[PDB]
JSON list of C-alpha atoms in Angstrom, two decimals:
[
{"chain": "A", "resi": 1, "resn": "UNK", "atom": "CA", "xyz": [0.00, 0.00, 0.00]},
{"chain": "A", "resi": 2, "resn": "UNK", "atom": "CA", "xyz": [1.08, 3.62, -0.49]},
{"chain": "A", "resi": 3, "resn": "UNK", "atom": "CA", "xyz": [0.45, 6.33, 2.14]},
{"chain": "A", "resi": 4, "resn": "UNK", "atom": "CA", "xyz": [-0.28, 10.03, 2.40]},
{"chain": "A", "resi": 5, "resn": "UNK", "atom": "CA", "xyz": [0.26, 12.93, 4.80]},
{"chain": "A", "resi": 6, "resn": "UNK", "atom": "CA", "xyz": [-2.04, 15.69, 5.95]},
{"chain": "A", "resi": 7, "resn": "UNK", "atom": "CA", "xyz": [-5.64, 16.42, 6.88]},
{"chain": "A", "resi": 8, "resn": "UNK", "atom": "CA", "xyz": [-7.29, 17.48, 3.61]},
{"chain": "A", "resi": 9, "resn": "UNK", "atom": "CA", "xyz": [-7.04, 14.57, 1.17]},
{"chain": "A", "resi": 10, "resn": "UNK", "atom": "CA", "xyz": [-9.70, 15.74, -1.26]},
{"chain": "A", "resi": 11, "resn": "UNK", "atom": "CA", "xyz": [-9.45, 14.19, -4.74]},
{"chain": "A", "resi": 12, "resn": "UNK", "atom": "CA", "xyz": [-6.22, 12.40, -3.77]},
{"chain": "A", "resi": 13, "resn": "UNK", "atom": "CA", "xyz": [-7.49, 8.88, -3.14]},
{"chain": "A", "resi": 14, "resn": "UNK", "atom": "CA", "xyz": [-5.49, 6.14, -4.85]},
{"chain": "A", "resi": 15, "resn": "UNK", "atom": "CA", "xyz": [-6.57, 2.93, -6.54]},
{"chain": "A", "resi": 16, "resn": "UNK", "atom": "CA", "xyz": [-5.77, -0.68, -5.75]},
{"chain": "A", "resi": 17, "resn": "UNK", "atom": "CA", "xyz": [-3.12, -2.88, -7.36]},
{"chain": "A", "resi": 18, "resn": "UNK", "atom": "CA", "xyz": [-2.66, -6.60, -6.72]},
{"chain": "A", "resi": 19, "resn": "UNK", "atom": "CA", "xyz": [-0.01, -8.58, -8.60]},
{"chain": "A", "resi": 20, "resn": "UNK", "atom": "CA", "xyz": [0.13, -12.29, -9.39]},
{"chain": "A", "resi": 21, "resn": "UNK", "atom": "CA", "xyz": [2.42, -15.19, -10.27]},
{"chain": "A", "resi": 22, "resn": "UNK", "atom": "CA", "xyz": [1.72, -18.26, -12.42]},
{"chain": "A", "resi": 23, "resn": "UNK", "atom": "CA", "xyz": [2.63, -21.88, -11.67]},
{"chain": "A", "resi": 24, "resn": "UNK", "atom": "CA", "xyz": [2.62, -24.48, -14.45]},
{"chain": "A", "resi": 25, "resn": "UNK", "atom": "CA", "xyz": [3.58, -28.11, -15.09]},
{"chain": "A", "resi": 26, "resn": "UNK", "atom": "CA", "xyz": [5.69, -30.15, -17.47]},
{"chain": "A", "resi": 27, "resn": "UNK", "atom": "CA", "xyz": [5.60, -33.65, -18.90]},
{"chain": "A", "resi": 28, "resn": "UNK", "atom": "CA", "xyz": [5.07, -36.89, -16.98]},
{"chain": "A", "resi": 29, "resn": "UNK", "atom": "CA", "xyz": [8.01, -39.03, -15.91]},
{"chain": "A", "resi": 30, "resn": "UNK", "atom": "CA", "xyz": [7.63, -42.72, -16.69]},
{"chain": "A", "resi": 31, "resn": "UNK", "atom": "CA", "xyz": [9.20, -46.10, -16.30]},
{"chain": "A", "resi": 32, "resn": "UNK", "atom": "CA", "xyz": [7.75, -48.40, -18.93]},
{"chain": "A", "resi": 33, "resn": "UNK", "atom": "CA", "xyz": [8.79, -51.99, -19.59]},
{"chain": "A", "resi": 34, "resn": "UNK", "atom": "CA", "xyz": [7.40, -55.08, -21.30]},
{"chain": "A", "resi": 35, "resn": "UNK", "atom": "CA", "xyz": [7.61, -58.68, -20.15]},
{"chain": "A", "resi": 36, "resn": "UNK", "atom": "CA", "xyz": [6.38, -62.00, -21.50]},
{"chain": "A", "resi": 37, "resn": "UNK", "atom": "CA", "xyz": [4.34, -64.43, -19.44]},
{"chain": "A", "resi": 38, "resn": "UNK", "atom": "CA", "xyz": [7.00, -67.10, -18.99]},
{"chain": "A", "resi": 39, "resn": "UNK", "atom": "CA", "xyz": [9.39, -64.47, -17.63]},
{"chain": "A", "resi": 40, "resn": "UNK", "atom": "CA", "xyz": [7.07, -64.09, -14.62]},
{"chain": "A", "resi": 41, "resn": "UNK", "atom": "CA", "xyz": [7.73, -67.59, -13.28]},
{"chain": "A", "resi": 42, "resn": "UNK", "atom": "CA", "xyz": [10.46, -65.94, -11.18]},
{"chain": "A", "resi": 43, "resn": "UNK", "atom": "CA", "xyz": [9.19, -62.61, -9.89]},
{"chain": "A", "resi": 44, "resn": "UNK", "atom": "CA", "xyz": [12.32, -61.11, -8.30]},
{"chain": "A", "resi": 45, "resn": "UNK", "atom": "CA", "xyz": [13.43, -59.14, -11.36]},
{"chain": "A", "resi": 46, "resn": "UNK", "atom": "CA", "xyz": [9.98, -57.60, -11.80]},
{"chain": "A", "resi": 47, "resn": "UNK", "atom": "CA", "xyz": [9.73, -56.45, -8.17]},
{"chain": "A", "resi": 48, "resn": "UNK", "atom": "CA", "xyz": [13.29, -55.14, -8.10]},
{"chain": "A", "resi": 49, "resn": "UNK", "atom": "CA", "xyz": [12.61, -53.18, -11.28]},
{"chain": "A", "resi": 50, "resn": "UNK", "atom": "CA", "xyz": [9.58, -51.61, -9.59]},
{"chain": "A", "resi": 51, "resn": "UNK", "atom": "CA", "xyz": [11.61, -50.58, -6.53]},
{"chain": "A", "resi": 52, "resn": "UNK", "atom": "CA", "xyz": [14.45, -49.16, -8.59]},
{"chain": "A", "resi": 53, "resn": "UNK", "atom": "CA", "xyz": [11.92, -47.24, -10.68]},
{"chain": "A", "resi": 54, "resn": "UNK", "atom": "CA", "xyz": [10.56, -45.61, -7.54]},
{"chain": "B", "resi": 1, "resn": "UNK", "atom": "CA", "xyz": [23.69, 25.83, 39.41]},
{"chain": "B", "resi": 2, "resn": "UNK", "atom": "CA", "xyz": [26.71, 28.12, 39.33]},
{"chain": "B", "resi": 3, "resn": "UNK", "atom": "CA", "xyz": [29.39, 27.86, 41.98]},
{"chain": "B", "resi": 4, "resn": "UNK", "atom": "CA", "xyz": [31.31, 30.79, 43.40]},
{"chain": "B", "resi": 5, "resn": "UNK", "atom": "CA", "xyz": [34.51, 31.21, 45.39]},
{"chain": "B", "resi": 6, "resn": "UNK", "atom": "CA", "xyz": [35.59, 33.37, 48.30]},
{"chain": "B", "resi": 7, "resn": "UNK", "atom": "CA", "xyz": [34.19, 34.85, 51.50]},
{"chain": "B", "resi": 8, "resn": "UNK", "atom": "CA", "xyz": [32.72, 38.24, 50.56]},
{"chain": "B", "resi": 9, "resn": "UNK", "atom": "CA", "xyz": [30.21, 37.41, 47.80]},
{"chain": "B", "resi": 10, "resn": "UNK", "atom": "CA", "xyz": [28.67, 40.85, 48.36]},
{"chain": "B", "resi": 11, "resn": "UNK", "atom": "CA", "xyz": [26.64, 42.11, 45.38]},
{"chain": "B", "resi": 12, "resn": "UNK", "atom": "CA", "xyz": [27.32, 38.81, 43.58]},
{"chain": "B", "resi": 13, "resn": "UNK", "atom": "CA", "xyz": [24.14, 36.86, 44.26]},
{"chain": "B", "resi": 14, "resn": "UNK", "atom": "CA", "xyz": [22.85, 35.15, 41.15]},
{"chain": "B", "resi": 15, "resn": "UNK", "atom": "CA", "xyz": [19.34, 34.34, 39.98]},
{"chain": "B", "resi": 16, "resn": "UNK", "atom": "CA", "xyz": [17.40, 31.23, 39.05]},
{"chain": "B", "resi": 17, "resn": "UNK", "atom": "CA", "xyz": [17.12, 29.82, 35.54]},
{"chain": "B", "resi": 18, "resn": "UNK", "atom": "CA", "xyz": [15.23, 26.73, 34.41]},
{"chain": "B", "resi": 19, "resn": "UNK", "atom": "CA", "xyz": [15.17, 25.82, 30.71]},
{"chain": "B", "resi": 20, "resn": "UNK", "atom": "CA", "xyz": [12.40, 24.17, 28.72]},
{"chain": "B", "resi": 21, "resn": "UNK", "atom": "CA", "xyz": [11.89, 21.81, 25.78]},
{"chain": "B", "resi": 22, "resn": "UNK", "atom": "CA", "xyz": [8.74, 21.70, 23.65]},
{"chain": "B", "resi": 23, "resn": "UNK", "atom": "CA", "xyz": [7.15, 18.56, 22.21]},
{"chain": "B", "resi": 24, "resn": "UNK", "atom": "CA", "xyz": [4.75, 19.01, 19.31]},
{"chain": "B", "resi": 25, "resn": "UNK", "atom": "CA", "xyz": [2.85, 16.94, 16.75]},
{"chain": "B", "resi": 26, "resn": "UNK", "atom": "CA", "xyz": [3.11, 16.24, 13.04]},
{"chain": "B", "resi": 27, "resn": "UNK", "atom": "CA", "xyz": [0.63, 15.84, 10.21]},
{"chain": "B", "resi": 28, "resn": "UNK", "atom": "CA", "xyz": [-1.74, 12.86, 10.13]},
{"chain": "B", "resi": 29, "resn": "UNK", "atom": "CA", "xyz": [-0.56, 9.93, 8.03]},
{"chain": "B", "resi": 30, "resn": "UNK", "atom": "CA", "xyz": [-3.15, 8.28, 5.81]},
{"chain": "B", "resi": 31, "resn": "UNK", "atom": "CA", "xyz": [-3.95, 5.41, 3.53]},
{"chain": "B", "resi": 32, "resn": "UNK", "atom": "CA", "xyz": [-6.74, 6.73, 1.32]},
{"chain": "B", "resi": 33, "resn": "UNK", "atom": "CA", "xyz": [-8.31, 4.89, -1.60]},
{"chain": "B", "resi": 34, "resn": "UNK", "atom": "CA", "xyz": [-11.46, 4.88, -3.71]},
{"chain": "B", "resi": 35, "resn": "UNK", "atom": "CA", "xyz": [-13.40, 1.96, -5.16]},
{"chain": "B", "resi": 36, "resn": "UNK", "atom": "CA", "xyz": [-16.47, 1.82, -7.36]},
{"chain": "B", "resi": 37, "resn": "UNK", "atom": "CA", "xyz": [-19.26, -0.45, -6.21]},
{"chain": "B", "resi": 38, "resn": "UNK", "atom": "CA", "xyz": [-18.56, -2.89, -9.04]},
{"chain": "B", "resi": 39, "resn": "UNK", "atom": "CA", "xyz": [-15.14, -3.53, -7.49]},
{"chain": "B", "resi": 40, "resn": "UNK", "atom": "CA", "xyz": [-16.73, -4.87, -4.29]},
{"chain": "B", "resi": 41, "resn": "UNK", "atom": "CA", "xyz": [-18.36, -7.98, -5.74]},
{"chain": "B", "resi": 42, "resn": "UNK", "atom": "CA", "xyz": [-15.08, -9.64, -4.75]},
{"chain": "B", "resi": 43, "resn": "UNK", "atom": "CA", "xyz": [-13.80, -7.85, -1.66]},
{"chain": "B", "resi": 44, "resn": "UNK", "atom": "CA", "xyz": [-10.58, -9.84, -1.18]},
{"chain": "B", "resi": 45, "resn": "UNK", "atom": "CA", "xyz": [-8.38, -7.12, -2.68]},
{"chain": "B", "resi": 46, "resn": "UNK", "atom": "CA", "xyz": [-10.07, -4.56, -0.42]},
{"chain": "B", "resi": 47, "resn": "UNK", "atom": "CA", "xyz": [-9.23, -6.51, 2.74]},
{"chain": "B", "resi": 48, "resn": "UNK", "atom": "CA", "xyz": [-5.68, -7.20, 1.62]},
{"chain": "B", "resi": 49, "resn": "UNK", "atom": "CA", "xyz": [-5.27, -3.48, 0.94]},
{"chain": "B", "resi": 50, "resn": "UNK", "atom": "CA", "xyz": [-6.45, -2.77, 4.49]},
{"chain": "B", "resi": 51, "resn": "UNK", "atom": "CA", "xyz": [-3.79, -5.15, 5.82]},
{"chain": "B", "resi": 52, "resn": "UNK", "atom": "CA", "xyz": [-1.10, -3.55, 3.64]},
{"chain": "B", "resi": 53, "resn": "UNK", "atom": "CA", "xyz": [-2.17, -0.15, 4.96]},
{"chain": "B", "resi": 54, "resn": "UNK", "atom": "CA", "xyz": [-1.68, -1.27, 8.55]}
]
């Protein structure tokens, strides 16, 4: 806000001003892999890949 | 007080003197603004301006 001195303030009132800032977003981050059915007989690699992705 | 030396001191009596300091005021300090009634449909800027003024 601005300010002002004195008693008589006639025709010296100010207006308001409020400023702003924008926030935006980018592109998603992915881990994306493919796996055949027979490769899921042993599930350690799949789970470890999930943890390392996190 | 003054201080004086000797025995006689005749015709050398002093007077009394007390000094003064004056405190006064200044001009009033103001935040003064104008708004049309259409600007008060959303009054958030008005309240935030009041806070800024304080």
